[PDB]
């Protein structure tokens, strides 16, 4: 009934059509699965199941989570499956993997997320036939990942709904984004991402490429050039490409086992999963998802907001990230101390486990005792998890 | 914790490009979600989470499970997500929903599966651009649903591997299929599918159509006409369209709650989830998946194979379905007493909950005490669950 | 400088996605080329060049006119090419083939048109790549065939412009269309199309099918049933599917040689090409094209409007066909005596030679001496040709 | 009776996906039509018809020749149409325009060719529907332009057939290409292409670009670097990208009128069309097309091979260009004195008029009296034209 995170790892977050432009998601997930096994001293033959969140798997083949486990050396006797709760998929898979051990149905779980938004294809239903007229080739990334299915507009429009409702101006969102760019750039140059990042070998034509640094992180971001950017969703809006997360590729996961299992193996876990929660909200303001999700998770853990030593709140948009900080009222100096998704990137299926990796390694590095990770979810949902160090 | 299935429902299984040719999967799932709520006397405002297995969601929009819950009246405060374990997705979602209640994280769960193989689009990655030459538009149904990602051939080829290793001839597979067609046709004419089936209204322009009968069920199947069919995968093989499951659309789900919760509401549950299991096998012979999965489920329940009163083993192929019966050795007269997927249909993401519906309502109809449902999974996996009546 | 039409033939006009749904245009053209050779007693080795009008050749391969000639038995030493003047392509190709003999550059020409609107594919420029967002698969039939490239609307909208300028009401267009349906229906049942139609054998997998009757001809068109039809282009317009031409497939051609050549071979020509003309008009009212084209053709032939015994004016739309009849003032009883494109069909690339075939054989049956064929052309053009019997 | 070329012009030949990557073909043709009118002092209202050869018009709209004329200022009263004889379309259109004046049906004709191989889309017939399985998106450039419709292989394979029958080694083909690169590079540096080239303004968003130089011209071509090139068609073949023409965009045309018309307007014509011819050959060796076509043109002109002062023979492939020169036996020093299609480029629909422009202006530059232009045509055809200076 006590589940710990024995190890964690993530690939570098690649830009849209960048280093991982032609790399399938399971190839990134396989590297992460092998990394959490080596870092914990656990062999692949000991894994019972691999649970990987993924939002855009179209065209990758039968169950990409199974392909990642098999390629990482996990034997055929184990099982693997994918799940989709949009942006919270990477974190919910960890909660799902924790429940497999809590119910006594599994002993060792590799849980996380993987996403290749670059490899997302364009699709169209053509079985009935198009007898006459033009038809649209639909971008699966925009349709199945970034567009609300109830109102039809982009997730950035939901951020404009939060910005108008919370009275967050353009200058306040740009200032929040600049702070995120500077924190991520300082953390990258100081090597605070080296422990969590496992290098990925991009096997391509004309030679292999080793990717071990987040390429989407901007250097020397300026407030004046960001004020010149046009709004990306509403012509009279405030959300721009500068104060919003990007389109990215990456993978992240963690190795799960019971606290007694880790103690017999001599493993010092990165943290203990104290509680988790998922709550729904109005799809028009889905960015407010972390507000009830974090409160329920802290309530289940018996913690107060002031008890938290470190917080990782995903920065899908500067508008929604400002609202979550104002509502919950926690000290912003402990939230995303090494930057957020505005600078690091936002691979939907993997962002949930990505910020968990950043949370775990920063908690151990500075000796934080209580931490929380949370994300907003499209369609009006949120997920959160409380972590305690051992 | 003791979790029971308070109610269950399913749509009729439609043929490929048939009654549900232009109906999205979440529309079928929404009808099933509302049905299990009315059948149990539980309102939509009481559901904590909806968990729906789905293999082919490309082009349907952000998280079709969330769309099904919202369309069925489930409030925005609740959560919803999809999961993919291929053919066992519909059944695993019930086991996953059971774990949400076992860990005290939820109270009432709608769990099941939905699949629209007809609405599966053709896709192609076109972000890098096609400078010269032809490129392939990939059928997501074949690629992401029916083709093994490790060996490259169809799931029907894996049935040929099972037929060769178990020495199951063409006449033995056709005889098994004829038995499935006759059992399903007799069950349909006797109305044994009426209780589990909830009608679906296909809203069109030239009038609405009510679908309340499985259209893929064949009437008067003859052994001689099936012996004339050419093999559909191997030119010198034995698996044909007659002795194999079809491509179908449909949805199925169940309402989950604790046994004490069901007693507080005066609900007579359809059954109690005693145990469940999922095991992996060699992808070349994925049809053997139910063999170790069923024994592991019976082992966790403390049951012997002889203790089972009824069995629902998915008939993905006659070759794999014969092998599972020969290895486990249970009485074939209690396995798929109302027919199987060869005659009823095989909507991959929903078949797990489809055979669970047939299992639950047949146990209640004839007073069976111990039941088991199991399916084979592509990529070399299997899933099983044991059900006991109250 | 006197070129006669030694023989002529055409396939039956098939409906959109009908009998010729999967038949390429050059296969239909090859049958017409072989027919006019046998009907005139000329061997394939004697043809110098084949000129076939075609508007929609995308996806059919290198020069479909060359494919039709080679398949029809025309030797490799001869030449072949296609031309595109939209709806007047079938007639202009005959005039172009006549000029080959008039300038002494050729002796025997097979000229006509072929069109397979059913086989017209959907296209999209994808060399630059689609990094993000949806893109349109463009119907080549609508884009390159039925949409004005200067104003962007359908040819039916240009018909509404002619109806508005000429004050042609809905009842006047429907009454004009009914006359065409009744004339075509009576002509088909009386066998008046048998001489001009050469049967085509549609080779399929489940048996060959011989198509020798115009499939688009409807039986018993009623003024009341057409008055209930909704307008097909303008919501407050008058052009409907009943009073407008359809989308059809077919091929037609004629064998051209000098009058001395026909006399040396003992060939009785169907008629002598007296004159031809092509004039442009405003693209907004392209249906008025036949008005100056016919007057310029009659001027070059030295004929008066009253001298014509029979007229074949293409019925692309009832609105444009009424305007040309009122302006030119010829007796409507001699115009389209066997029906027009509203009832028979409108294969764009072949319609020019289609109405020429009907003109030649109708002139021969009733002994008409002077005839004229004309069509309207998209983009604001018209073509006409005068024929005199031998 | 005697038709002269009053003026001629052409755009620069752009590389594949280069300066004209997003420029439609009719935009290039419109500039050429306006150029030949201004250079001759003839207003747009005096042209009777515009004839433009084009092989790949899919997706450009209704009759791109009509779009080019209207955009160039040609009034709506005139007519326009396109024609397709593959690689000989640009030259055949000039012969066709000459026949319009010879038969007294027109007085002033703008004839030439235009081609945008970069804007060629990918297509697929989808009206019947794809019920199951993958399907191919067909590149219209390769299928309708570069692939033989009778044998299924590329035009480069037909060049391998000519090389095999004529025993043309790899070094012999490479030496011919090197000579073409050096002659074309020297002609560009000396400004010998400035008179025939009319600048084209590429209007874009981030600024306009003026294209007035042939971009496909290679600088400092080395014989050894072409020997290192891999064969592009046959793994054991000899035709490579160095000794074969490229994929290019461009447009070219000429102003046609009678000799008396040019004298009445005070125009100094570029030359007189003495004769023309088109002959077919074996499709396997389509590169031999120019051999019988040139002989028939010289026969009609009453000229011997020794009477020719300058020759422009299209260099579709080094294998076919060597064979036609060796068979006809004309002095290689007078053929393609300014380079050929290997270095200049090969826009299929415009190459016929492209080499005519180079022929006309080079004859005037060095005072050549008798010239001939010829091209090979896919599918087994050839075209030729004899020009004499006034
Ligand atoms: C906002 C969005 C539409 C932008 O698309 P994009 O391709 O990522 O925008 P880009 O990364 O190409 O950057 C666009 C341009 O802005 C500039 N720019 C971006 N950020 C900048 C910054 N912080 N400072 C200065 N310039 C910046 C870049 O230079 C870039 O090139 P350009 O100026 O020459 O055009 C897209 O990133 C997006 O939708 N993000 C949200 C993702 C999402 O919703 N996830 C789900 C959350 S629930
Ligand atoms: C077999 C398969 C490849 C194609 O069959 P299909 O696409 O459904 O096409 P059909 O069902 O219409 O069968 C086609 C023909 O067989 C005939 N047929 C099918 N079953 C028959 C039977 N039991 N008796 C007689 N004839 C039969 C049909 O009538 C039809 O005849 P026709 O061609 O003259 O119209 C497809 O059904 C399939 O992939 N099945 C496996 C699904 C799967 O792998 N699921 C996952 C397992 S883990
Ligand atoms: C007019 C047009 C939009 C209609 O396309 P369409 O819908 O496929 O025409 P259809 O006849 O196949 O369908 C029309 C409907 O009205 C009915 N209908 C059509 N003509 C009818 C008539 N004369 N009387 C009664 N009913 C009629 C048809 O039965 C059908 O209804 P249904 O299919 O449910 O039974 C299309 O044919 C068109 O664009 N034509 C013009 C083509 C063109 O521009 N050519 C070049 C001119 S220069
Ligand atoms: C032969 C063909 C397939 C190659 O086209 P292509 O390869 O795209 O032309 P490219 O310039 O892109 O060649 C690309 C490569 O060849 C190299 N190359 C091309 N020509 C070269 C030369 N003369 N010397 C040295 N290198 C050369 C390029 O530098 C480039 O190097 P890379 O391998 O590192 O990419 C194509 O040009 C073709 O089909 N030509 C025939 C066209 C035709 O048939 N027209 C109709 C007449 S019948
Ligand atoms: N960003
Ligand atoms: N079946
Ligand atoms: N019609
Ligand atoms: N080249």
Ligand that lies nearest to the alpha carbon of residue B214, given by its number in the listed order: 6
> In whole angstroms, what is the distance from residue C320 CA to residue C326 CA?
10
Are C202 and C208 in contact, with CB atoms under 8 Å apart? yes
DSSP B225: H
Which value, to the nearest 10 degrees, does the dihedral of the CA atoms of residues D257, D261, D267, D273 take? Answer: 40
- Tell me if C11 sits within 8 A of C31, measured CB to CB: yes
Our CA-based measurement puts residue A46 at a distance from the nearest CA of chain B, in whole angstroms, of 13
- Residue D140 with chain C: CB contacts under 8 Å: 58-59, 123
CA of B246 to the centre of ligand 2 (A): 6
Separation CA B93–CA B78 (nearest Å)? 17
A38, burial (CB in 10 Å: exposed 0-12, middle 13-18, buried 19+):
middle
| Distance of alpha carbon C338 from alpha carbon C336, whole angstroms | 5
Other Cβ atoms less than 10 A from the Cβ of A345: the count is 28
Task: Identify whether the C-beta of residue C57 lies closer than 8 Å to the C-beta of residue D142.
Answer: no
Domain extent listing, chain D:
3-120+246-388
Q: Do D127 and A127 touch (CB under 8 A)?
A: no
Write the DSSP string, D42-86: --GGG--EEEEE-S--TTS-S-HHHHHHHHTT--TTSEEEEEE-G
Q: How far is the CA of B185 from the centre of ligand 6 (A)?
A: 13
Query: What subunits make at least 3 CB pairs under 8 angstroms with D?
Result: A, B, C
Residues of A in contact with C137 (CB under 8 A): 124, 130, 134-137
8 Å CB contact of B140 and A120: no
Question: B84–A76: do the CB atoms touch at under 8 Å?
Answer: no
| Residue A9 · residue A196 · CB < 8 Å | yes
Query: SS3 of C110, please?
Result: strand
What backbone phi and psi angles, to 5 degrees, belong to D68?
Answer: -70, -40
Chain A residue with CA closest to D132: the answer is A127
Length of chain C: 390
Interface test with D, best of C379, C380, C383, C385 (most D CBs within 10 A): C379
Measured between beta carbons, the chain B residues lying within 8 angstroms of C130 are: 126-127, 129
Contact by Cβ (8 Å): A305, A149: no
Return the structure tokens found at D348.
Answer: 């299929």
Give the number of other CB atoms < 10 A from CB of residue B18.
17
- Cβ-based neighbours of D232, under 8 Å, separated by 6 or more: D156, D239, D240, D241, D244
Taking alpha carbons only, the member of B17, B12, B14 closest to residue B32 is B12
Nearest CA to ligand 3 atom 36: C246
What are the pocket residues of ligand 5 if the criterion is a CB atom closer than 6 Å to any ligand atom?
Answer: A 244-246, 342
CA A377 to chain centre: 11
CB A60 within 8 A of CB A24: yes
Question: Closest approach of chain D CAs to the CA of A385, in angstroms?
Answer: 43
DSSP tally for chain C: helices H, then strands E: 11, 14
Q: Which two tokens stand for residue B14?
A: 């439609």
Residue A130: CB atoms within 10 Å: 18
What experimental approach yielded this model? X-ray
Q: Taking chain B, what is the end-to-end CA distance rounded to the nearest angstrom?
A: 15
SS3 for C123? Answer: strand
C243 close to C341: Cβ distance less than 8 angstroms: no
Residue of B nearest to D120 (CA): B132
What are the φ and ψ backbone dihedral angles of B210, each rounded to 5 degrees?
-100, 120
Report DSSP state, residue B10.
E
Q: Do B130 and C127 touch (CB under 8 A)?
A: yes
| Residues belonging to chain D | 390
DSSP 8-state code for residue D287: G
Write the burial class of residue A83 (CB in 10 Å: 0-12 exposed, 13-18 middle, 19+ buried).
Answer: buried
For residues A173-191, one letter each, b for 16 or more C-beta atoms within 10 angstroms of the residue's C-beta and e for the rest, the string is bbbbbbbbbebbbebbeee
* Contact status, residue D371 vs residue D310, Cβ threshold 8 Å: yes
Ligand 3 pocket test: which of C21, C55, C237, C241 has the largest number of ligand atoms within 8 Å of its C-beta?
C241
- Where do the DSSP E strands lie in B259-341? 271-280, 310-313
Would you call C280 and D77 a contact, using CB atoms and an 8 Å cutoff? Answer: yes
Q: Which of A277, A273, A184 is nearest to A6 (CA)?
A: A273
Nearest to C289 by CA among C252, C327, C253: C327
- C221 within ligand 7 shell (Cβ under 6 A): no
Residues ≥6 apart with Cβ < 8 Å to A94? A5, A51, A111, A112, A254, A256, A273, A352, A353, A356, A385
Chains touching chain C, criterion 3+ CB pairs below 8 Å = A, B, D
Cα(A194) to centroid(ligand 1), Å: 26
- Structure token digits, residue A267: 């493993």
Q: How many CB atoms lie within 10 A of CB B364?
A: 17
Q: Where are the alpha helices (DSSP H) in B41-139?
A: 64-71, 89-102
Q: Among C250, C310, C255, C293, which Cα is nearest to C94's? A: C255
Fold category of B3-121+246-388 in CATH: Peroxisomal Thiolase; Chain A, domain 1 (3.40.47)
The CATH T-level fold of domain D3-120+246-388 is Peroxisomal Thiolase; Chain A, domain 1 (3.40.47)
Task: Name the active-site residue from D87, D154, D322, D386.
Answer: D87
Q: Do C141 and A134 touch (CB under 8 A)?
A: no
Asked if residues B158 and A164 have their Cβ atoms less than 8 Å apart, the reply is: no
Resolution of this entry, Å: 2.3
State whether the beta carbon of D368 lies less than 6 angstroms from ligand 8: no
Q: CA-CA distance, D291 to D288, in Å (whole number)?
A: 6
| B381: phi then psi, degrees, rounded to nearest 5 | -145, 165
Which residues make beta-bridge pairs with C251?
Answer: C114
User: How many beta carbons lie within 10 A of that of residue B136, not counting itself?
Assistant: 13
- Give Cα D16 distance to the centre of its chain: 16
Ligand 1 geometric centre to CA of A246 (Å): 6
Any idea which residue has 């500077």 for tokens?
A182
Rounded distance from Cα D315 to ligand 4 centre (Å)? 14
Tell me the nearest-neighbour CA distance from D150 into chain C, angstroms: 8
Q: Which residues 6+ apart lie within 8 Å of B236 measured at CB?
A: none
Contact criterion met (CB below 8 Å) for D363 and D259: no
Of the listed ligands, the closest to the CA of C181 is 3
Distances in whole angstroms, Cα of residue C32 to Cα of each of A325, C11, C112, C253: 77, 7, 9, 6
What are the structure tokens assigned to A18, written together? 């960048």
Q: What is the DSSP letter of B72?
A: T
Tell me the pairing of strands B370-377 and B381-388: antiparallel
Confirm whether D26 is a catalytic residue.
no
Helix (H) or strand (E) holding C387: strand C381-388
Contacting residues of B for C127, CB less than 8 Å apart: 129-132
How would DSSP label each residue in D343-356? Answer: HH---HHHHHHHHH
Residues of C with Cβ-Cβ distance to A17 under 8 angstroms: 131
Rounded Cα–Cα distance for residues A150 and C126 (Å): 31
Tell me if C131 and A17 make a contact (CB, 8 A cut-off): yes
- Put simply, the answer to whether A128 touches B86 (Cβ < 8 Å) is no
CB atoms within 10 A of CB D300: 16
Does residue C373 contact residue C384 with C-beta atoms inside 8 Å?
Answer: yes
In angstroms, the separation between the Cα of residue B206 and the nearest Cα of chain C is: 16
C192: CA distance to ligand 7 center in Å?
Answer: 20
Which protein residue has the closest C-alpha to ligand 1 atom 46? Answer: A146
Identify the bridge partners of residue A279 per DSSP, sorted by sequence position: A382
Which residue in A127, A130, A131 is closest to D131 by CB distance? Answer: A127
What distance in Å separates the CA atoms of residue B289 and residue D315, rounded to the nearest whole number?
63
Rounded to an integer, what distance in angstroms lies between the CA atom of residue A71 and that of residue B387? 35
Nearest to B136 among D131, D134, D141 (CB): D134
Q: Is D215 exposed, middle or buried (0-12, 13-18, 19+ CB in 10 A)?
A: middle
Q: How far is C255 from chain A (nearest CA, A)?
A: 34
Which is nearest to D379 in space by CA: D69, D77, D118, D86?
Answer: D86
Query: What is the SS3 assignment for chain A?
Result: CCEEEEEEEECCCEECCCCCCCCCHHHHHHHHHHHHHHHHCCCHHHCCEEEEECCCCCCCCCCHHHHHHHHCCCCCCCEEEEEECHHHHHHHHHHHHHHHHHCCCCCEEEEEEEEECCCCCEEECCCCCCCCCCEEEEEHHHHHHHECCCCCCEHHHHHHHHHHHCCCCHHHHHHHHHHHHHHHHHHHHCCCCCCCECCEEEEECCEEEEECCCCCCCCCCCHHHHHCCCECCCCCCCCECCCECCCEEEEEEEEEEEHHHHHHCCCCCCEEEEEEEEEECCHHHHHHCHHHHHHHHHHHHCCCHHHCCEEEECCCEHHHHHHHHHHHCCCHHHECCCCCHHHHCCCHHHHHHHHHHHHHHHHHHHCCCEEEEEEEECCCEEEEEEEECC
Shortest CA distance from A132: residue in chain D: D127
CB pairs under 8 A between B and D: 45
Q: Is the minimum distance from the CB of A318 to ligand 1 under 6 angstroms?
A: no
Q: Name the residue in chain A with its Cα closest to that of D125.
A: A130
Q: Is A15 left (phi over 0), alpha (psi -120 to 50) or beta?
A: beta
Residues A83/A93, Cβ–Cβ less than 8 Å: yes
Q: Would residue A335 be called left, alpha or beta, if left means φ above 0 and alpha means ψ between -120 and 50 degrees?
A: beta
Question: How far does the CA of residue B132 sit from the closest CA of chain C (Å)?
Answer: 7
For residue B361, give the DSSP letter.
Answer: H
Q: Exposure of C264 by Cβ count < 10 A (0-12 exposed, 13-18 middle, 19+ buried)? A: exposed
Helix (H) or strand (E) holding C189: helix C170-189
Q: Please give the structure tokens belonging to residue D346.
A: 């090969």
Question: Chain A contacts of D132, Cβ < 8 Å?
Answer: 127
> Which residue in chain C is spatially nearest to B59 when comparing CA positions?
C134
> What is the C-alpha to C-alpha distance for residues A357 and A183, in angstroms, rounded to an integer?
17
Interface of D with A (CB under 8 A): 126-132
């Amino acid at each position: 009934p006590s589940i710990v995170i024995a190890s964690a790892a993530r690939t570098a977050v690649g830009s849209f059509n960048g280093a991982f432009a032609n790399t399938p998601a399971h190839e990134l997930g396989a590297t992460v699965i092998s990394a959490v096994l080596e870092r914990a001293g656990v062999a692949a033959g000991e894994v019972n199941e691999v649970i990987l969140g993924q939002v855009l798997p179209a065209g990758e083949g039968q169950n990409p989570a199974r392909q990642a486990a098999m390629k990482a050396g996990v034997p055929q006797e184990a099982t693997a499956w994918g799940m989709n709760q949009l942006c919270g998929s990477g974190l919910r898979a960890v909660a799902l993997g924790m429940q497999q051990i809590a119910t006594g149905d599994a002993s060792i779980i590799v849980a996380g997320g993987m996403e290749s938004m670059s490899m997302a294809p364009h699709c169209a239903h053509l079985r009935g036939g198009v007898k006459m007229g033009d038809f649209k080739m639909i971008d699966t990334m925009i349709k199945d990942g970034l567009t609300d299915a109830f109102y039809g507009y982009h997730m950035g429009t939901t951020a404009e709904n939060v910005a108008k409702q919370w009275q967050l101006s353009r200058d306040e969102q740009d200032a929040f984004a600049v702070a995120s760019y500077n924190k991520a750039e300082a953390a990258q140059k100081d090597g605070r991402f080296k422990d969590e990042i496992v290098p990925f070998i991009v096997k391509g034509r004309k030679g292999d490429i080793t990717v071990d640094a987040d390429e989407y992180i901007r250097h020397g971001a300026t407030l004046d050039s960001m004020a010149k950017l046009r709004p990306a969703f509403d012509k009279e809006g405030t959300v721009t490409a500068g104060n919003a997360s990007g389109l990215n590729d990456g993978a992240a996961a963690a190795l799960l086992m019971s606290e007694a299992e880790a103690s017999r193996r001599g493993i010092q876990p990165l943290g203990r999963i104290v509680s988790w929660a998922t709550v729904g909200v109005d799809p028009k303001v889905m960015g407010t998802g972390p507000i009830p999700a974090s409160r329920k998770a802290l309530e289940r853990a018996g913690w107060k907001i002031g008890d938290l030593d470190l917080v990782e709140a995903n920065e899908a948009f500067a508008a929604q990230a400002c609202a979550v900080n104002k509502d919950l009222g926690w000290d912003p100096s402990i939230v995303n101390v090494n930057g957020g998704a505005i600078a690091i990137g936002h691979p939907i299926g993997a962002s949930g486990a990505r910020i968990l990796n950043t949370l775990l390694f920063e908690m151990k590095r500075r000796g934080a005792r209580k931490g929380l990770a949370t994300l907003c979810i499209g369609g009006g949902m949120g997920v959160a998890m409380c972590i305690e160090s051992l």
